[PDB]
């Protein structure tokens, strides 16, 4: 059927019954050890939470409810006259575990169009932000202010059953996804197009297309790039700072608006949300140093000199994943068919030819292949989206789809408050003796 | 000396050297097991992080760098003509591990006065928020907007040494603590005093007194209640949602403004920030049901009936702490000397007489004593602070002191990104076989 809520309602008791019998048997089964180093080291390598929407497969990349990225590219529905997978369909996949039909994606598109509205106090707030305020701060602050439209918040205050929490979490999550393009386009134009207006929603367009229209972009291939981008950056397990922050805040029964905004303050941190920008800065510098006509030998020399100097090539290397990131590969294929003669893409492609063979030869990088962030900037830049501070806002709007799909499930399955135990240094030294 | 930064700079390399040798020896020492139930159960009972500023002692209550609450009441400096401990002094204690002198508290008071300023865009934003927007949302959104004044953010973007991060984290944290009363009083008056102004900072007053003036309160004993309140709600280990959220977001190198605002979205959740309000609602109902002249027997009957009905007495019970919460006791003593004939306090006191003996007799509650949240509402209500939505904003302003004391230390000690490992249900079932 074309009602995502009905399907979701049917799947929940079944997953509840699967988890109930699993924990009965294996609840006290041990899955790991905690060390002193793990406590000092940011829980590195500690299995700490259940996050159902995605899992990293060391041989194939990130999987979306079992489906690899190549599989999602082929199976997820497209726009009419398009060939890139729609985010609507990714969202359906993460909530249900099932690839949706054309009829389901179209319905979801219409639903997000229906729900897309901003109250006048958020509009006013956004127009009064200074140029001085970072776009990620604008995004978080405006989403926090939209919790005045949270119906989970208001219903909880009146009293509702634990077993029904997921219902209004789903409703609030759908409304938030619907509004994100409006909030994000508003920020873009207030900062980078002199306060010009974002125009109106067209209810017959998909999410991505309404977003590029609101941004003021016109090129069909930019809209196609945005569909791909938003689908592939949508989720990457629960351990990363943006996912875990939404999870943790969500666990206190804070509504989707509050949870997502907290997540964006995490994504804004330079150790989580700047990888795209860092690669692009480094490519731009490289191009200046070495020139646009560079020989395979001269680039190899520069890479070798970089590594011998003890610096790293940004966007390359991984401890776990054993092949090139499919999300990188998706963007490479886009580039080859739509901007194969762009000079910055040629540099990116030349790096793909040369760097990994150098890295295998040095023999240090556990796996010498590039990730998604090595390829994303040159594509945005090609279509005139050159405001690098804004890149993390796009990642955010994408990542909403994954974190909110999980959040619905967390509440459906009754996941409790996240409350690990902390220790001081002095305390942990005493605990060591026992 | 009277420079907190200098003292802090002297202590850091010493704690670094203590941690270095500790992890050399005991780094691979195991401190616990992780079970499947712990993953499904919000990391309950998993030792997961190092948080230096406070530790829960099962026999004495929460300790602030080793000092119990009774010790902090006697040793922390007071205002002239006061007898309640100043928050300034608590902050000094958490940063240094040392009880400050009078000269140090006074200096800290002057520093927070010096730094207390709002830019015009935050003022405008606060005045344009609707009545419809919850005060906790107002607080978080305005603090996120103040990251435009973060000097850690701007310095990081230009490039600074890992070893110097704590310096600007300290600066930004001091500025944020300084501004919180302005932001919080602004919210109070815009919501509950028809938009009237908060007036100016007096540089010769302490933090609490400037806050009550800005709120529009006049009673000396209210200012004294606020000093006590802000000192005792300041920190309670790292495991709670507000602390852990600041810690986690902080770990991505997000600045103190972004970290604290994310923390407030966590505190806003009903499972973390509503305990005060819930007790007060329940006391008000109780008073109606049973009357103001209630006999010890009639109240005992109502408590017994409540428990036999299988409901709980809010603000009573604890799995770990084996005596009455000192933070409760602090408020009881305040009440006995300043509002001993208040009818709601008499009810609170009558409950203290009767409930715990009933709970020991039922023999279920591991420990039958009350916590801080059982006593805080009746005191706020007595002085005319009756806007219960606002109670969580006060808790927030207090909790800033503890979470930001830790955050400075996290960066001084080079704590890395918090990144536990997540698993799907399906994945965790497969991992079980191995």
PDB file of C-alpha atoms in Angstrom, chain B residues 107-321:
ATOM      1  CA  UNK B 107      38.313  37.950  41.216  1.00  0.00           C
ATOM      2  CA  UNK B 108      36.238  35.300  39.457  1.00  0.00           C
ATOM      3  CA  UNK B 109      33.084  37.355  40.149  1.00  0.00           C
ATOM      4  CA  UNK B 110      34.726  40.402  38.525  1.00  0.00           C
ATOM      5  CA  UNK B 111      35.872  38.352  35.522  1.00  0.00           C
ATOM      6  CA  UNK B 112      32.348  37.016  34.811  1.00  0.00           C
ATOM      7  CA  UNK B 113      31.000  40.602  35.191  1.00  0.00           C
ATOM      8  CA  UNK B 114      33.679  41.844  32.728  1.00  0.00           C
ATOM      9  CA  UNK B 115      32.816  39.213  30.109  1.00  0.00           C
ATOM     10  CA  UNK B 116      29.005  39.509  30.321  1.00  0.00           C
ATOM     11  CA  UNK B 117      27.736  40.949  27.032  1.00  0.00           C
ATOM     12  CA  UNK B 118      25.201  39.957  24.363  1.00  0.00           C
ATOM     13  CA  UNK B 119      25.503  41.006  20.731  1.00  0.00           C
ATOM     14  CA  UNK B 120      22.481  42.829  19.311  1.00  0.00           C
ATOM     15  CA  UNK B 121      21.501  39.920  17.035  1.00  0.00           C
ATOM     16  CA  UNK B 122      20.984  37.587  20.081  1.00  0.00           C
ATOM     17  CA  UNK B 123      18.914  40.301  21.922  1.00  0.00           C
ATOM     18  CA  UNK B 124      16.720  40.774  18.864  1.00  0.00           C
ATOM     19  CA  UNK B 125      16.382  37.023  18.401  1.00  0.00           C
ATOM     20  CA  UNK B 126      15.300  36.550  22.040  1.00  0.00           C
ATOM     21  CA  UNK B 127      12.712  39.392  21.897  1.00  0.00           C
ATOM     22  CA  UNK B 128      11.180  37.920  18.700  1.00  0.00           C
ATOM     23  CA  UNK B 129      10.706  34.380  20.064  1.00  0.00           C
ATOM     24  CA  UNK B 130       6.956  33.531  20.467  1.00  0.00           C
ATOM     25  CA  UNK B 131       5.317  32.674  23.897  1.00  0.00           C
ATOM     26  CA  UNK B 132       4.607  29.364  22.206  1.00  0.00           C
ATOM     27  CA  UNK B 133       8.352  28.425  22.203  1.00  0.00           C
ATOM     28  CA  UNK B 134       9.474  26.473  25.281  1.00  0.00           C
ATOM     29  CA  UNK B 135      12.036  28.281  27.474  1.00  0.00           C
ATOM     30  CA  UNK B 136      14.588  25.415  27.061  1.00  0.00           C
ATOM     31  CA  UNK B 137      14.330  25.795  23.272  1.00  0.00           C
ATOM     32  CA  UNK B 138      14.894  29.562  23.606  1.00  0.00           C
ATOM     33  CA  UNK B 139      17.939  28.866  25.772  1.00  0.00           C
ATOM     34  CA  UNK B 140      19.545  26.358  23.365  1.00  0.00           C
ATOM     35  CA  UNK B 141      18.831  28.349  20.191  1.00  0.00           C
ATOM     36  CA  UNK B 142      20.302  31.553  21.658  1.00  0.00           C
ATOM     37  CA  UNK B 143      23.455  29.832  22.924  1.00  0.00           C
ATOM     38  CA  UNK B 144      23.941  28.205  19.476  1.00  0.00           C
ATOM     39  CA  UNK B 145      23.645  31.739  17.955  1.00  0.00           C
ATOM     40  CA  UNK B 146      26.295  33.006  20.343  1.00  0.00           C
ATOM     41  CA  UNK B 147      28.884  30.704  18.669  1.00  0.00           C
ATOM     42  CA  UNK B 148      29.435  33.654  16.328  1.00  0.00           C
ATOM     43  CA  UNK B 149      31.466  34.984  19.303  1.00  0.00           C
ATOM     44  CA  UNK B 150      33.461  31.752  19.765  1.00  0.00           C
ATOM     45  CA  UNK B 151      37.202  32.462  19.592  1.00  0.00           C
ATOM     46  CA  UNK B 152      38.028  28.740  19.689  1.00  0.00           C
ATOM     47  CA  UNK B 153      36.059  28.285  16.488  1.00  0.00           C
ATOM     48  CA  UNK B 154      37.845  31.120  14.682  1.00  0.00           C
ATOM     49  CA  UNK B 155      41.300  30.230  15.945  1.00  0.00           C
ATOM     50  CA  UNK B 156      40.928  26.523  14.943  1.00  0.00           C
ATOM     51  CA  UNK B 157      39.969  27.576  11.407  1.00  0.00           C
ATOM     52  CA  UNK B 158      43.253  29.573  11.214  1.00  0.00           C
ATOM     53  CA  UNK B 159      45.341  26.716  12.655  1.00  0.00           C
ATOM     54  CA  UNK B 160      46.504  26.186  16.252  1.00  0.00           C
ATOM     55  CA  UNK B 161      48.458  23.540  18.140  1.00  0.00           C
ATOM     56  CA  UNK B 162      46.647  20.526  19.673  1.00  0.00           C
ATOM     57  CA  UNK B 163      48.450  21.197  22.971  1.00  0.00           C
ATOM     58  CA  UNK B 164      47.017  24.782  23.149  1.00  0.00           C
ATOM     59  CA  UNK B 165      43.290  23.937  22.489  1.00  0.00           C
ATOM     60  CA  UNK B 166      42.371  24.150  26.213  1.00  0.00           C
ATOM     61  CA  UNK B 167      43.393  27.836  26.343  1.00  0.00           C
ATOM     62  CA  UNK B 168      40.636  29.131  24.064  1.00  0.00           C
ATOM     63  CA  UNK B 169      38.192  26.498  25.292  1.00  0.00           C
ATOM     64  CA  UNK B 170      38.729  28.064  28.781  1.00  0.00           C
ATOM     65  CA  UNK B 171      38.225  31.578  27.346  1.00  0.00           C
ATOM     66  CA  UNK B 172      35.024  30.631  25.469  1.00  0.00           C
ATOM     67  CA  UNK B 173      33.735  28.716  28.547  1.00  0.00           C
ATOM     68  CA  UNK B 174      34.280  31.695  30.841  1.00  0.00           C
ATOM     69  CA  UNK B 175      32.464  34.013  28.367  1.00  0.00           C
ATOM     70  CA  UNK B 176      29.524  31.581  28.110  1.00  0.00           C
ATOM     71  CA  UNK B 177      29.165  31.206  31.897  1.00  0.00           C
ATOM     72  CA  UNK B 178      29.268  34.994  32.103  1.00  0.00           C
ATOM     73  CA  UNK B 179      26.445  35.464  29.580  1.00  0.00           C
ATOM     74  CA  UNK B 180      24.073  32.682  30.786  1.00  0.00           C
ATOM     75  CA  UNK B 181      22.275  34.817  33.409  1.00  0.00           C
ATOM     76  CA  UNK B 182      21.607  37.496  30.763  1.00  0.00           C
ATOM     77  CA  UNK B 183      20.213  34.965  28.330  1.00  0.00           C
ATOM     78  CA  UNK B 184      18.186  33.160  30.974  1.00  0.00           C
ATOM     79  CA  UNK B 185      16.750  36.372  32.581  1.00  0.00           C
ATOM     80  CA  UNK B 186      15.823  37.694  29.152  1.00  0.00           C
ATOM     81  CA  UNK B 187      13.760  34.543  28.445  1.00  0.00           C
ATOM     82  CA  UNK B 188      12.022  34.797  31.876  1.00  0.00           C
ATOM     83  CA  UNK B 189      10.957  38.389  31.385  1.00  0.00           C
ATOM     84  CA  UNK B 190       9.958  38.027  27.746  1.00  0.00           C
ATOM     85  CA  UNK B 191       7.731  35.051  28.696  1.00  0.00           C
ATOM     86  CA  UNK B 192       6.462  35.965  32.189  1.00  0.00           C
ATOM     87  CA  UNK B 193       6.965  39.753  32.699  1.00  0.00           C
ATOM     88  CA  UNK B 194       5.586  41.109  29.364  1.00  0.00           C
ATOM     89  CA  UNK B 195       8.950  41.847  27.676  1.00  0.00           C
ATOM     90  CA  UNK B 196      10.228  44.227  30.341  1.00  0.00           C
ATOM     91  CA  UNK B 197      14.002  44.772  30.324  1.00  0.00           C
ATOM     92  CA  UNK B 198      16.591  42.950  32.408  1.00  0.00           C
ATOM     93  CA  UNK B 199      18.588  46.041  33.366  1.00  0.00           C
ATOM     94  CA  UNK B 200      22.384  46.190  33.567  1.00  0.00           C
ATOM     95  CA  UNK B 201      25.225  44.145  35.100  1.00  0.00           C
ATOM     96  CA  UNK B 202      26.724  45.522  38.354  1.00  0.00           C
ATOM     97  CA  UNK B 203      30.461  44.644  38.309  1.00  0.00           C
ATOM     98  CA  UNK B 204      30.733  44.644  42.114  1.00  0.00           C
ATOM     99  CA  UNK B 205      28.087  41.877  42.545  1.00  0.00           C
ATOM    100  CA  UNK B 206      28.463  38.102  42.384  1.00  0.00           C
ATOM    101  CA  UNK B 207      27.000  35.939  39.567  1.00  0.00           C
ATOM    102  CA  UNK B 208      23.856  34.843  41.463  1.00  0.00           C
ATOM    103  CA  UNK B 209      22.952  38.392  42.616  1.00  0.00           C
ATOM    104  CA  UNK B 210      23.274  39.857  39.105  1.00  0.00           C
ATOM    105  CA  UNK B 211      21.024  36.964  37.957  1.00  0.00           C
ATOM    106  CA  UNK B 212      18.191  37.603  40.534  1.00  0.00           C
ATOM    107  CA  UNK B 213      18.358  41.350  39.781  1.00  0.00           C
ATOM    108  CA  UNK B 214      18.020  40.619  36.060  1.00  0.00           C
ATOM    109  CA  UNK B 215      15.098  38.233  36.751  1.00  0.00           C
ATOM    110  CA  UNK B 216      13.367  41.090  38.620  1.00  0.00           C
ATOM    111  CA  UNK B 217      13.539  39.457  42.123  1.00  0.00           C
ATOM    112  CA  UNK B 218      14.179  41.583  45.180  1.00  0.00           C
ATOM    113  CA  UNK B 219      14.219  39.271  48.273  1.00  0.00           C
ATOM    114  CA  UNK B 220      17.740  38.688  49.765  1.00  0.00           C
ATOM    115  CA  UNK B 221      16.663  35.151  50.694  1.00  0.00           C
ATOM    116  CA  UNK B 222      15.743  34.387  47.074  1.00  0.00           C
ATOM    117  CA  UNK B 223      19.263  35.471  46.040  1.00  0.00           C
ATOM    118  CA  UNK B 224      20.601  33.204  48.826  1.00  0.00           C
ATOM    119  CA  UNK B 225      18.427  30.284  47.586  1.00  0.00           C
ATOM    120  CA  UNK B 226      19.783  30.825  44.039  1.00  0.00           C
ATOM    121  CA  UNK B 227      23.450  30.687  45.228  1.00  0.00           C
ATOM    122  CA  UNK B 228      22.806  27.360  46.976  1.00  0.00           C
ATOM    123  CA  UNK B 229      20.759  25.997  44.052  1.00  0.00           C
ATOM    124  CA  UNK B 230      23.361  26.825  41.405  1.00  0.00           C
ATOM    125  CA  UNK B 231      26.222  25.383  43.510  1.00  0.00           C
ATOM    126  CA  UNK B 232      24.470  22.047  44.276  1.00  0.00           C
ATOM    127  CA  UNK B 233      23.007  21.304  40.817  1.00  0.00           C
ATOM    128  CA  UNK B 234      26.387  22.067  39.107  1.00  0.00           C
ATOM    129  CA  UNK B 235      27.694  18.522  38.290  1.00  0.00           C
ATOM    130  CA  UNK B 236      26.763  14.838  38.737  1.00  0.00           C
ATOM    131  CA  UNK B 237      29.283  12.595  36.892  1.00  0.00           C
ATOM    132  CA  UNK B 238      29.541  12.266  33.101  1.00  0.00           C
ATOM    133  CA  UNK B 239      26.979   9.533  32.543  1.00  0.00           C
ATOM    134  CA  UNK B 240      23.825  11.637  32.673  1.00  0.00           C
ATOM    135  CA  UNK B 241      22.425  12.891  29.306  1.00  0.00           C
ATOM    136  CA  UNK B 242      23.391  16.596  29.606  1.00  0.00           C
ATOM    137  CA  UNK B 243      27.020  15.903  30.664  1.00  0.00           C
ATOM    138  CA  UNK B 244      27.624  13.078  28.166  1.00  0.00           C
ATOM    139  CA  UNK B 245      26.039  15.135  25.320  1.00  0.00           C
ATOM    140  CA  UNK B 246      28.439  18.072  26.040  1.00  0.00           C
ATOM    141  CA  UNK B 247      31.313  15.559  26.231  1.00  0.00           C
ATOM    142  CA  UNK B 248      30.461  13.802  22.969  1.00  0.00           C
ATOM    143  CA  UNK B 249      29.813  16.956  20.911  1.00  0.00           C
ATOM    144  CA  UNK B 250      32.940  18.554  22.561  1.00  0.00           C
ATOM    145  CA  UNK B 251      35.013  15.531  21.395  1.00  0.00           C
ATOM    146  CA  UNK B 252      34.485  16.573  17.755  1.00  0.00           C
ATOM    147  CA  UNK B 253      36.180  19.916  18.640  1.00  0.00           C
ATOM    148  CA  UNK B 254      32.827  21.746  18.556  1.00  0.00           C
ATOM    149  CA  UNK B 255      33.258  24.897  20.711  1.00  0.00           C
ATOM    150  CA  UNK B 256      31.718  25.399  24.196  1.00  0.00           C
ATOM    151  CA  UNK B 257      28.653  27.199  22.815  1.00  0.00           C
ATOM    152  CA  UNK B 258      27.769  24.402  20.419  1.00  0.00           C
ATOM    153  CA  UNK B 259      28.529  21.728  23.054  1.00  0.00           C
ATOM    154  CA  UNK B 260      26.450  23.368  25.780  1.00  0.00           C
ATOM    155  CA  UNK B 261      23.445  23.999  23.512  1.00  0.00           C
ATOM    156  CA  UNK B 262      23.428  20.363  22.433  1.00  0.00           C
ATOM    157  CA  UNK B 263      23.598  19.479  26.115  1.00  0.00           C
ATOM    158  CA  UNK B 264      20.452  21.600  26.762  1.00  0.00           C
ATOM    159  CA  UNK B 265      18.486  19.763  24.065  1.00  0.00           C
ATOM    160  CA  UNK B 266      19.337  16.643  26.060  1.00  0.00           C
ATOM    161  CA  UNK B 267      18.386  18.213  29.410  1.00  0.00           C
ATOM    162  CA  UNK B 268      15.049  19.303  27.831  1.00  0.00           C
ATOM    163  CA  UNK B 269      14.029  15.664  27.442  1.00  0.00           C
ATOM    164  CA  UNK B 270      11.350  14.543  29.904  1.00  0.00           C
ATOM    165  CA  UNK B 271      13.448  11.577  31.183  1.00  0.00           C
ATOM    166  CA  UNK B 272      16.277  13.935  32.269  1.00  0.00           C
ATOM    167  CA  UNK B 273      15.039  17.466  33.064  1.00  0.00           C
ATOM    168  CA  UNK B 274      11.519  17.200  34.609  1.00  0.00           C
ATOM    169  CA  UNK B 275      12.031  15.550  38.062  1.00  0.00           C
ATOM    170  CA  UNK B 276      11.526  18.863  40.057  1.00  0.00           C
ATOM    171  CA  UNK B 277       8.321  19.689  38.179  1.00  0.00           C
ATOM    172  CA  UNK B 278       6.941  16.115  38.528  1.00  0.00           C
ATOM    173  CA  UNK B 279       7.354  16.159  42.316  1.00  0.00           C
ATOM    174  CA  UNK B 280       5.657  19.561  42.536  1.00  0.00           C
ATOM    175  CA  UNK B 281       2.642  18.498  40.407  1.00  0.00           C
ATOM    176  CA  UNK B 282       2.292  15.414  42.657  1.00  0.00           C
ATOM    177  CA  UNK B 283       2.563  17.408  45.924  1.00  0.00           C
ATOM    178  CA  UNK B 284      -0.100  19.873  44.704  1.00  0.00           C
ATOM    179  CA  UNK B 285      -2.460  16.998  43.836  1.00  0.00           C
ATOM    180  CA  UNK B 286      -1.719  15.330  47.179  1.00  0.00           C
ATOM    181  CA  UNK B 287      -2.536  18.475  49.097  1.00  0.00           C
ATOM    182  CA  UNK B 288      -5.934  18.728  47.356  1.00  0.00           C
ATOM    183  CA  UNK B 289      -6.823  15.059  47.932  1.00  0.00           C
ATOM    184  CA  UNK B 290      -5.854  14.815  51.619  1.00  0.00           C
ATOM    185  CA  UNK B 291      -6.073  18.449  52.932  1.00  0.00           C
ATOM    186  CA  UNK B 292      -3.683  20.820  54.670  1.00  0.00           C
ATOM    187  CA  UNK B 293      -4.196  19.661  58.318  1.00  0.00           C
ATOM    188  CA  UNK B 294      -3.384  16.033  57.513  1.00  0.00           C
ATOM    189  CA  UNK B 295      -2.781  13.560  60.335  1.00  0.00           C
ATOM    190  CA  UNK B 296       0.379  11.383  60.323  1.00  0.00           C
ATOM    191  CA  UNK B 297      -2.011   8.383  60.055  1.00  0.00           C
ATOM    192  CA  UNK B 298      -4.011   9.695  57.093  1.00  0.00           C
ATOM    193  CA  UNK B 299      -0.825  10.547  55.106  1.00  0.00           C
ATOM    194  CA  UNK B 300       0.655   7.105  55.924  1.00  0.00           C
ATOM    195  CA  UNK B 301      -2.597   5.583  54.577  1.00  0.00           C
ATOM    196  CA  UNK B 302      -2.287   7.546  51.335  1.00  0.00           C
ATOM    197  CA  UNK B 303       1.394   6.589  50.859  1.00  0.00           C
ATOM    198  CA  UNK B 304       0.559   2.896  51.547  1.00  0.00           C
ATOM    199  CA  UNK B 305      -2.389   3.033  49.131  1.00  0.00           C
ATOM    200  CA  UNK B 306      -0.171   4.654  46.451  1.00  0.00           C
ATOM    201  CA  UNK B 307       2.434   1.861  46.749  1.00  0.00           C
ATOM    202  CA  UNK B 308      -0.200  -0.916  46.999  1.00  0.00           C
ATOM    203  CA  UNK B 309      -1.741   0.555  43.828  1.00  0.00           C
ATOM    204  CA  UNK B 310       1.754  -0.031  42.340  1.00  0.00           C
ATOM    205  CA  UNK B 311       2.612   3.642  41.752  1.00  0.00           C
ATOM    206  CA  UNK B 312       5.723   5.342  43.161  1.00  0.00           C
ATOM    207  CA  UNK B 313       6.453   8.334  45.411  1.00  0.00           C
ATOM    208  CA  UNK B 314       8.318  10.843  43.197  1.00  0.00           C
ATOM    209  CA  UNK B 315      11.712  12.071  44.426  1.00  0.00           C
ATOM    210  CA  UNK B 316      12.206   8.953  46.644  1.00  0.00           C
ATOM    211  CA  UNK B 317      14.273   5.818  45.950  1.00  0.00           C
ATOM    212  CA  UNK B 318      17.795   5.080  44.693  1.00  0.00           C
ATOM    213  CA  UNK B 319      19.691   1.977  43.480  1.00  0.00           C
ATOM    214  CA  UNK B 320      23.106   3.117  44.787  1.00  0.00           C
ATOM    215  CA  UNK B 321      23.142   6.035  47.249  1.00  0.00           C
TER     216      UNK B 321
END
